[PDB]
Design a protein around this motif. Structure first.
Motif, PDB file in Angstrom:
ATOM      1  N   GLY A   1       0.850  -1.234   0.056  1.00 62.18           N
ATOM      2  CA  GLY A   1      -0.010  -0.032  -0.046  1.00 62.18           C
ATOM      3  C   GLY A   1       0.785   1.184   0.076  1.00 62.18           C
ATOM      4  O   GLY A   1       1.932   1.258   0.378  1.00 62.18           O
ATOM      5  N   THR A   2       0.138   2.447  -0.486  1.00 58.17           N
ATOM      6  CA  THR A   2       0.842   3.688  -0.173  1.00 58.17           C
ATOM      7  C   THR A   2       1.199   3.835   0.894  1.00 58.17           C
ATOM      8  O   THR A   2       2.532   4.215   1.064  1.00 58.17           O
ATOM      9  CB  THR A   2      -0.059   4.833  -0.893  1.00 58.17           C
ATOM     10  OG1 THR A   2      -0.674   4.389  -2.234  1.00 58.17           O
ATOM     11  CG2 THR A   2       0.685   6.067  -0.839  1.00 58.17           C
ATOM     12  N   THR A   3       0.423   3.698   2.085  1.00 64.64           N
ATOM     13  CA  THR A   3       1.059   4.022   3.202  1.00 64.64           C
ATOM     14  C   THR A   3       1.281   2.913   4.256  1.00 64.64           C
ATOM     15  O   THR A   3       2.166   2.918   5.124  1.00 64.64           O
ATOM     16  CB  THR A   3       0.002   5.124   3.936  1.00 64.64           C
ATOM     17  OG1 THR A   3      -1.330   4.492   4.332  1.00 64.64           O
ATOM     18  CG2 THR A   3      -0.227   6.325   2.942  1.00 64.64           C
ATOM     19  N   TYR A   4       0.442   1.941   4.136  1.00 60.13           N
ATOM     20  CA  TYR A   4       0.640   0.665   4.735  1.00 60.13           C
ATOM     21  C   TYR A   4       0.833  -0.683   3.985  1.00 60.13           C
ATOM     22  O   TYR A   4      -0.029  -0.399   2.837  1.00 60.13           O
ATOM     23  CB  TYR A   4      -0.374   0.495   5.901  1.00 60.13           C
ATOM     24  CG  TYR A   4      -0.529   1.421   7.143  1.00 60.13           C
ATOM     25  CD1 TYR A   4      -0.751   2.477   7.119  1.00 60.13           C
ATOM     26  CD2 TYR A   4       0.187   0.912   8.198  1.00 60.13           C
ATOM     27  CE1 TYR A   4      -0.881   3.202   8.356  1.00 60.13           C
ATOM     28  CE2 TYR A   4       0.421   1.658   9.148  1.00 60.13           C
ATOM     29  CZ  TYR A   4      -0.067   2.886   9.412  1.00 60.13           C
ATOM     30  OH  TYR A   4      -0.045   3.804  10.376  1.00 60.13           O
TER      31      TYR A   4
ATOM     32  N   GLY B   1      -8.042   5.240   2.181  1.00 56.25           N
ATOM     33  CA  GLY B   1      -6.896   4.846   2.696  1.00 56.25           C
ATOM     34  C   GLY B   1      -6.172   5.925   3.621  1.00 56.25           C
ATOM     35  O   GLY B   1      -6.765   6.784   4.181  1.00 56.25           O
ATOM     36  N   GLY B   2      -4.757   5.914   3.581  1.00 56.58           N
ATOM     37  CA  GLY B   2      -3.908   6.863   4.204  1.00 56.58           C
ATOM     38  C   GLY B   2      -3.508   7.977   3.359  1.00 56.58           C
ATOM     39  O   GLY B   2      -3.365   9.092   4.038  1.00 56.58           O
ATOM     40  N   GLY B   3      -3.332   7.563   1.931  1.00 61.54           N
ATOM     41  CA  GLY B   3      -3.111   8.812   1.326  1.00 61.54           C
ATOM     42  C   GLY B   3      -4.042   8.827   0.142  1.00 61.54           C
ATOM     43  O   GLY B   3      -4.019   9.944  -0.529  1.00 61.54           O
TER      44      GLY B   3
ATOM     45  N   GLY C   1      -6.616   9.576   4.917  1.00 62.39           N
ATOM     46  CA  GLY C   1      -6.390   9.634   6.329  1.00 62.39           C
ATOM     47  C   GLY C   1      -5.529  10.582   7.024  1.00 62.39           C
ATOM     48  O   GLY C   1      -5.421  11.421   7.696  1.00 62.39           O
ATOM     49  N   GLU C   2      -4.372  10.798   6.134  1.00 60.45           N
ATOM     50  CA  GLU C   2      -3.168  11.829   6.349  1.00 60.45           C
ATOM     51  C   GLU C   2      -3.932  13.230   6.232  1.00 60.45           C
ATOM     52  O   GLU C   2      -3.514  14.041   7.074  1.00 60.45           O
ATOM     53  CB  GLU C   2      -2.092  11.723   5.728  1.00 60.45           C
TER      54      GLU C   2
ATOM     55  N   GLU D   1      -3.174  11.309  14.799  1.00 62.62           N
ATOM     56  CA  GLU D   1      -3.628  10.093  14.221  1.00 62.62           C
ATOM     57  C   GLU D   1      -4.054   8.964  15.204  1.00 62.62           C
ATOM     58  O   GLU D   1      -5.041   8.387  14.888  1.00 62.62           O
ATOM     59  CB  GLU D   1      -2.331   9.581  13.185  1.00 62.62           C
ATOM     60  CG  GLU D   1      -2.842   8.036  12.594  1.00 62.62           C
ATOM     61  CD  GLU D   1      -2.071   7.489  11.786  1.00 62.62           C
ATOM     62  OE1 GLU D   1      -0.627   7.709  11.970  1.00 62.62           O
ATOM     63  OE2 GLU D   1      -2.254   6.302  11.036  1.00 62.62           O
TER      64      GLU D   1
ATOM     65  N   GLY E   1      -9.949  -0.100   3.305  1.00 62.28           N
ATOM     66  CA  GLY E   1      -8.984   1.142   3.840  1.00 62.28           C
ATOM     67  C   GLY E   1      -9.414   1.650   5.146  1.00 62.28           C
ATOM     68  O   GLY E   1     -10.490   1.515   5.556  1.00 62.28           O
TER      69      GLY E   1
ATOM     70  N   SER F   1      -9.495   4.355   6.636  1.00 62.28           N
ATOM     71  CA  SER F   1     -10.140   5.305   7.094  1.00 62.28           C
ATOM     72  C   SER F   1     -11.775   5.294   6.896  1.00 62.28           C
ATOM     73  O   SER F   1     -12.463   5.968   7.469  1.00 62.28           O
ATOM     74  CB  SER F   1      -9.836   6.569   6.140  1.00 62.28           C
ATOM     75  OG  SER F   1      -8.411   6.900   6.033  1.00 62.28           O
TER      76      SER F   1
ATOM     77  N   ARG G   1     -13.129   3.160   8.604  1.00 60.40           N
ATOM     78  CA  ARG G   1     -13.576   2.916   9.886  1.00 60.40           C
ATOM     79  C   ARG G   1     -14.298   4.153  10.579  1.00 60.40           C
ATOM     80  O   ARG G   1     -14.996   4.236  11.636  1.00 60.40           O
ATOM     81  CB  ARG G   1     -12.445   2.483  10.847  1.00 60.40           C
ATOM     82  CG  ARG G   1     -11.963   1.112  10.813  1.00 60.40           C
ATOM     83  CD  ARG G   1     -10.853   0.625  11.482  1.00 60.40           C
ATOM     84  NE  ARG G   1     -10.612  -0.716  11.465  1.00 60.40           N
ATOM     85  CZ  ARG G   1      -9.376  -1.297  11.097  1.00 60.40           C
ATOM     86  NH1 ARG G   1      -8.276  -0.462  11.194  1.00 60.40           N
ATOM     87  NH2 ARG G   1      -9.260  -2.437  11.078  1.00 60.40           N
ATOM     88  N   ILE G   2     -14.192   5.372   9.884  1.00 53.78           N
ATOM     89  CA  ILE G   2     -14.659   6.609  10.468  1.00 53.78           C
ATOM     90  C   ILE G   2     -16.174   6.671  10.410  1.00 53.78           C
ATOM     91  O   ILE G   2     -16.793   6.327   9.242  1.00 53.78           O
ATOM     92  CB  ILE G   2     -14.141   7.643   9.711  1.00 53.78           C
ATOM     93  CG1 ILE G   2     -12.583   8.063   9.938  1.00 53.78           C
ATOM     94  CG2 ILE G   2     -14.765   8.737  10.431  1.00 53.78           C
ATOM     95  CD1 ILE G   2     -11.947   8.777   9.107  1.00 53.78           C
TER      96      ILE G   2
HETATM   97  N1  ADP Z   1      -9.734   2.841  13.355  1.00 51.88           N
HETATM   98  C1  ADP Z   1      -9.213   3.921  12.623  1.00 51.88           C
HETATM   99  N2  ADP Z   1     -10.030   5.139  12.378  1.00 51.88           N
HETATM  100  C2  ADP Z   1      -9.614   6.006  11.411  1.00 51.88           C
HETATM  101  N3  ADP Z   1      -8.732   5.955  10.613  1.00 51.88           N
HETATM  102  C3  ADP Z   1      -7.955   4.589  10.629  1.00 51.88           C
HETATM  103  C4  ADP Z   1      -8.106   3.699  11.777  1.00 51.88           C
HETATM  104  N4  ADP Z   1      -7.403   2.583  11.424  1.00 51.88           N
HETATM  105  C5  ADP Z   1      -6.416   3.227  10.298  1.00 51.88           C
HETATM  106  N5  ADP Z   1      -7.142   4.338   9.933  1.00 51.88           N
HETATM  107  C6  ADP Z   1      -6.295   5.259   8.912  1.00 51.88           C
HETATM  108  O1  ADP Z   1      -6.219   4.419   7.768  1.00 51.88           O
HETATM  109  C7  ADP Z   1      -5.047   5.123   7.135  1.00 51.88           C
HETATM  110  C8  ADP Z   1      -4.373   3.853   6.282  1.00 51.88           C
HETATM  111  O2  ADP Z   1      -5.076   3.002   5.499  1.00 51.88           O
HETATM  112  P1  ADP Z   1      -4.885   1.697   4.897  1.00 51.88           P
HETATM  113  O3  ADP Z   1      -5.989   1.243   4.058  1.00 51.88           O
HETATM  114  O4  ADP Z   1      -4.509   0.755   6.048  1.00 51.88           O
HETATM  115  O5  ADP Z   1      -3.204   1.918   4.046  1.00 51.88           O
HETATM  116  P2  ADP Z   1      -3.104   2.081   2.541  1.00 51.88           P
HETATM  117  O6  ADP Z   1      -4.136   3.399   2.359  1.00 51.88           O
HETATM  118  O7  ADP Z   1      -1.808   2.304   2.528  1.00 51.88           O
HETATM  119  O8  ADP Z   1      -3.621   0.853   1.754  1.00 51.88           O
HETATM  120  C9  ADP Z   1      -4.355   5.879   7.898  1.00 51.88           C
HETATM  121  O9  ADP Z   1      -4.804   7.170   7.479  1.00 51.88           O
HETATM  122  C10 ADP Z   1      -4.747   5.405   9.125  1.00 51.88           C
HETATM  123  O10 ADP Z   1      -4.624   6.508  10.153  1.00 51.88           O
END
Ligand code: ADP
Ligand code: MG
Length: 380
Positions: free
Chosen positions: A9-12, A200-202, A229-230, A267, A337, A339, A341-342
């Protein structure tokens, strides 16, 4: 020995394995089921993952992230030139290709994006080997649906450098659909439209797939490669930096470490606000020996991001338009992703879809790796 699924992933990044009929998402050596797509260099060490992300405050110029934004691109691409203006690390051109430049053990070193991503893939392979025992051979690796052949091939190259047999490169939304078994549900034709809402994060990706006879077809894609999310963290950072200035008459803005530590705290608080209505901020010695302890509510967090949350519906509308579908012709909506979860995001999306229940039973930040692990087991 099973094959693994890797969401690079871009961020994770996230790695899963299918064994004894089920997927296990594999925790890393800090106990985390996702690993930051970060690589840090110093005069004595190369750090990858949580270790790299957790020391970014102390080492911003030689901590690489966002390599996925460079992979398979050319240095002169408008996207690369634009992104470079926002990164703390240096990017240079070598034979027309971007490379990150760092100081590592007494030398200036440059790395292709696929070398950085290979370092992340090697970490995910090592996590999987610690989990499984022995050596991992084969993997499915995922990419965004919009990735072109250069980006896909550079991702394959990262896999080759790592020493994996890349069984297949599959699209992220397709992996998510596979995780939910949407290609093994139904027999008759028709009413096989899935919308994947991936925040996601980005990046933010909306994809509409139609799935007939086990064949995934991407009907449309939309989104925003600079929304994630960032950006929600940054809205909190601005808000709480203003608060610190109001309460303590100190402006942390010019101090990179203080801003980064506040960002990390934001975060953390944001994640808590997905399951609680309030969260604490506890930062010892934020600036000039002054602590910053405060509280933030879910409601306030939603206000700070009201435009960005509401704005996620526009790419949904666009994806529907491009697919020539009405919202009522979507049979399944899948959250992908971290985000997603919000709560406010979920509520906006469900309301847009007239109360229709969302698929979110698979941890959204794990769903891509989950589907990749399923596909890897199938490909054997
Ligand atoms: N419980 C949560 N509530 C809100 N945001 C979350 C939660 N868990 C992870 N995130 C956010 O998800 C983002 C990462 O998204 P992810 O899908 O795991 O990675 P990527 O976007 O790299 O594929 C980050 O901005 C992180 O803070
Ligand atoms: Mg993702």
């Amino acid at each position: 020995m099973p094959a693994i699924g890797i969401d690079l992933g871009t961020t994770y990044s996230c790695v899963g394995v299918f064994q004894h009929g089920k997927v296990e998402i594999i925790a890393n050596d800090q106990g985390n089921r996702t690993t930051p797509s970060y690589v840090a260099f110093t005069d004595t060490e190369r750090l990858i993952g949580d270790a790299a992300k957790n020391q970014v405050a102390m080492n911003p110029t030689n901590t690489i992230f966002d390599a996925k934004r460079l992979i398979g691109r050319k240095f002169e691409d408008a996207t690369v030139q634009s992104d470079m203006k926002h990164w703390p690390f240096r990017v240079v051109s070598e034979g027309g290709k971007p490379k990150v430049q760092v100081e590592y053990k007494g030398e200036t070193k440059t790395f292709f994006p696929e070398e950085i991503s290979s370092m992340v893939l090697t970490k995910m392979k090592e996590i999987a080997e610690a989990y499984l025992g022995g050596k991992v051979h084969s993997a499915v690796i995922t990419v965004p649906a919009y990735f072109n052949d250069s980006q896909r091939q550079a991702t394959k190259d990262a896999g080759t450098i790592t020493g994996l047999n890349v069984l297949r490169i599959i699209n992220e939304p397709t992996a998510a659909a596979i995780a939910y078994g949407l290609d093994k549900k139904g027999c008759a034709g028709g009413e096989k439209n899935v919308l994947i809402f991936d925040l996601g994060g980005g990046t933010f990706d909306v994809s509409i797939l139609t799935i007939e006879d086990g064949i995934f077809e991407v009907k449309s894609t939309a989104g925003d490669t600079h929304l994630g999310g960032e950006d929600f963290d940054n809205r909190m950072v601005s808000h709480l930096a203003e608060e610190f200035k109001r309460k303590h008459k100190k402006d942390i803005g010019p101090n990179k470490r203080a801003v980064r530590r506040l960002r990390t705290a934001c975060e953390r608080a944001k994640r808590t606000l997905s399951s609680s209505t309030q969260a604490s901020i506890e930062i010892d010695s934020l600036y000039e020996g002054v602590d910053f302890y405060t509280s933030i509510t879910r409601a306030r967090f939603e206000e700070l991001n009201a435009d960005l949350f509401r704005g996620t519906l526009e790419p949904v509308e666009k994806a529907l338009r491009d697919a020539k579908l009405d919202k009522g012709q979507i049979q399944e909506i899948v959250l992908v992703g971290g985000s997603t979860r919000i709560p406010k995001i979920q509520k906006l999306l469900q309301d847009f879809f007239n109360g229709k229940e969302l698929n979110k039973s698979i941890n959204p930040d794990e769903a891509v790796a989950y589907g990749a692990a399923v596909q890897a087991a199938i490909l054997i």
